[PDB]
């Protein structure tokens, strides 16, 4: 999933669109992506209780 | 040319049930023994496709493509010998014909003054056309080999095919298989991808005429077409990577 | 020291008795593979360039580009021509581009017209016979004529207009052979009282001054649509390397791995495809129809078991989830 | 400039460059008088076949428009807490508390 960005592959928003663009993209993945796995850690604290 | 056959007449909406028939891969993708979920111009399952028939009677009426088309054709000699595609089928526009030689498909989008009922006799435009000039697109596909003359037997040619333009791309899916209704599930595959980028609300098709004005008989052959609508489907793939079920997210 | 890895991983220069992860074994590529699809289907880009004939300035002939393969290599690794100059791009930089329409004409100029050929130029020649629009994307090509266009004493075959009734657009071929009328008085057809003949022949010789002498000039006029390219240029590829840790170059596919012998069918149509995770499994060759397995490089997990620094400083790395074998 | 440093013949004086090998790297001057090479053929030190002269003149007239119009490029480049700062506009000072 693209969490809001442009596209969920790093290599096209790098390889495309401008520096000042791209680390924003690749920010809203990466911001996103510790998202899900923040929720996962969560859900095995639970679990592991 | 301009007159009326015996063939054309009022007719009542005939119409049949398509179940299963309907779904094509959406992409070029490759995916093997997974399950994936797309939303895509689709066939309804268990929806109502407008049933044609030729023959003392010839179906061959002004049909809109505002939501697609698919065309699914039950024959032995291919009788259907093409399609034409275009708005006001006319020589104020382009529009798009499909004639298929039965050696190389010829496809040319041109300004074209059509007829209401075209025909092919070896092939004569008219009484399809009567002139055509100010075009620069011209196609044509593979060389094959083909059988117009009649066949015994079963109905060996199913041929169903879906005909959609998206922002301008004419994208042919294409399907043969042999076999007044058909049954079983396939996914079709694609075949002709034209950036054509033309406005077609409407189309017609194409018969083969034999004979041993109203001198020409109408070959025998069925047909019916259905619509597209912009449903999600769960396509099933299998190991070597073909679509064996699909199942409509919503019916 | 996978000990020191330990202690930079926990921040802290005493290390207390027990296992502890560092870091992640990873095989790092070496080569990169670079591939590129072949340039079959040329387009005959000749019949402008080395065309025998040629057309005059308002008879320019324009040679339709499209679903073809226009191959500039070597004539830009090359250049055996007078001038080129244009706006926008540079012509070198045409030979690795995608085009959805392309137009190649050809007509010949005098020297002095040169100058009469850029993109929104005004003058004699640009406003009253051919002249690029203000939005040109392409780029001309001027080409030295004198052995081949030229002809002795002159060449009268071929005219060219000084005048028009009007200010012509870009990219319009006028044959019209009217009279040019500045007064009232009809011309009728005939140079005459307030009427001048626009029309005149070409000198063009090789023993003449650079002033007037035949250069053919090609303008190519690019144009991308949202249309796909039907028209690419050259491009060169490298080799291809299997069973070895390598970056993926590829036209429409980028990445990292190595590649292995697939036992997966493809459709024709399909380059490459993509598994469970939306990553691409495995690729095609573009210049020839093989499928190859993408497979991620080596890698494992490594931790560090150590005694309290305050003991001893021996260290005991454990590679997980990679055999004996792979570790090397 | 278009009052000043035009010409009615233009002044080509200013020069720039349009050939080089490769991108040229910010905050880099190019003084190299070296003619661009395409091909094998050596120059010689002059443009000819495969060799080309990158160097040229500005347009600078006062009649044409703004493309023959001259501008006067001045680029400040700030280092912000990369040292002491010595440097700032006209503020005041007080003492300290």
Same mark, same amino acid.
Not at chain 2, 125 to 154: H, I, W
């Given at each position: 999933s693209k969490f809001g960005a442009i596209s969920s592959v790093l290599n096209d928003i790098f390889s495309r669109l401008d520096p000042p663009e791209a680390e924003v993209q690749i920010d809203r993945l990466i911001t996103g992506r510790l998202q899900s796995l923040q929720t996962y850690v969560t859900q095995q604290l639970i679990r592991a209780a | 040319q301009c007159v009326n056959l015996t063939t054309r007449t009022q007719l009542p909406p005939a119409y049949t049930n398509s179940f299963t028939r309907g779904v094509y891969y959406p992409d070029k993708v490759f995916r093997s023994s997974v399950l994936h979920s797309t939303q895509d111009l &689709?066939? +309804?399952? &268990?929806?109502?496709?407008?049933?044609?028939?030729?023959?003392?009677?010839? $179906?061959?009426?002004?049909? +809109?493509?505002? $939501?697609?088309?698919?065309?699914?054709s039950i024959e032995k000699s291919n009788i259907i010998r093409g399609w034409i595609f275009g708005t006001t089928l006319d020589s104020k526009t382009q529009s798009l014909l499909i004639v298929n030689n039965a050696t190389n498909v010829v496809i040319k989008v041109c300004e074209f003054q059509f007829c209401n009922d075209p025909?092919? $006799?070896?092939?004569?435009? &008219?009484?399809?056309?009567?002139?055509?000039?100010?075009?620069?697109?011209?196609?044509?596909?593979?060389?094959?080999?083909? $059988?117009?003359?009649?066949?015994?037997?079963? &109905?060996?040619?199913?041929?169903?095919?879906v005909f959609k333009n998206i922002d301008g791309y004419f994208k042919i899916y294409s399907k043969h298989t042999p076999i007044d209704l058909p049954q079983g599930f396939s996914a079709l595959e694609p075949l002709v991808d034209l950036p054509i980028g033309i406005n077609i609300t409407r189309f017609q098709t194409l018969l083969a005429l034999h004979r041993s004005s109203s001198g020409w008989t109408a070959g025998a052959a069925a047909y019916y077409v259905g619509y597209l609508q912009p449903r999600t489907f769960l396509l099933k793939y299998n190991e070597n990577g073909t679509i064996t079920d699909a199942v409509d997210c919503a019916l | 020291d996978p000990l020191s890895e330990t202690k930079c991983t926990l921040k802290s220069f005493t290390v207390e008795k027990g296992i502890y992860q560092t870091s992640n074994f990873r095989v790092q590529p070496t080569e990169s593979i670079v591939?590129?699809? !072949?340039?079959?289907?040329?387009?005959?880009?000749?019949?402008? #360039? =080395?065309? *025998?004939?040629?057309?005059?300035?308002?008879?320019?002939? %324009?040679? %339709?580009?499209? !679903?073809?393969?226009? @191959?500039?290599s070597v004539?830009?690794?090359?250049?055996?021509? #007078?001038?080129?100059?244009?706006?926008?791009?540079?012509?070198?930089?045409? =030979? @690795?581009?995608?085009? *959805? !329409?392309?137009?190649? /004409?050809?007509?010949?100029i005098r020297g002095d017209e040169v %100058?009469?050929?850029?993109?929104?130029? *005004?003058? =004699?020649?640009?406003?009253? !016979?051919?002249?690029?629009?203000? /939005?040109? *994307?392409?780029?001309?090509?001027?080409?030295?004529?004198?052995?081949? @266009?030229?002809?002795?004493?002159?060449?009268?075959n071929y005219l060219y207009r000084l005048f028009r009734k009007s200010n012509l657009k870009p990219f319009e071929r006028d044959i019209s052979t009217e009279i040019y009328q500045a007064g009232n008085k009809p011309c009728n057809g005939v140079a005459g009282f307030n009427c001048y003949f626009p029309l005149r022949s070409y000198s063009f010789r090789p023993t003449y001054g650079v002033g007037h002498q035949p250069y053919r000039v090609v303008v190519l006029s690019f144009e991308l649509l949202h249309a796909p390219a039907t028209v690419c240029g050259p491009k060169k590829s490298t080799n291809l390397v299997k069973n070895k840790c390598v970056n993926f170059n590829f036209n429409g596919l980028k990445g990292t791995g190595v590649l292995t012998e697939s036992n997966k069918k493809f459709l024709p149509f399909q380059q490459f495809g993509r598994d469970i995770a939306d990553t691409t499994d495995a690729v095609r060759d573009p210049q020839t129809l093989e499928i190859l397995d993408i497979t991620p490089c080596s890698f494992g997990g490594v931790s560090v078991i150590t005694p309290g620094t305050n003991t001893s400083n021996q260290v005991a790395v454990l590679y997980q989830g990679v055999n004996c074998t792979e570790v090397p």
């Open positions: - | &689709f066939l +309804p399952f &268990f929806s109502n496709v407008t049933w044609f028939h030729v023959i003392k009677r010839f $179906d061959n009426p002004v049909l +809109p493509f505002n $939501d697609g088309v698919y065309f699914a025909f092919l $006799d070896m092939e004569s435009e &008219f009484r399809v056309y009567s002139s055509a000039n100010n075009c620069t697109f011209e196609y044509v596909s593979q060389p094959f080999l083909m $059988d117009l003359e009649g066949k015994q037997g079963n &109905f060996k040619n199913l041929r169903e095919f | 591939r590129f699809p !072949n340039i079959t289907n040329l387009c005959p880009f000749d019949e402008v #360039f =080395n065309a *025998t004939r040629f057309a005059s300035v308002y008879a320019w002939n %324009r040679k %339709r580009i499209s !679903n073809c393969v226009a @191959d500039y004539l830009y690794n090359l250049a055996p021509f #007078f001038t080129f100059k244009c706006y926008g791009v540079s012509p070198t930089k045409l =030979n @690795d581009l995608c085009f *959805t !329409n392309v137009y190649a /004409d050809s007509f010949v %100058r009469q050929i850029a993109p929104g130029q *005004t003058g =004699n020649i640009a406003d009253y !016979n051919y002249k690029l629009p203000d /939005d040109f *994307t392409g780029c001309v090509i001027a080409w030295n004529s004198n052995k081949l @266009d030229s002809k002795v004493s002159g060449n009268y």
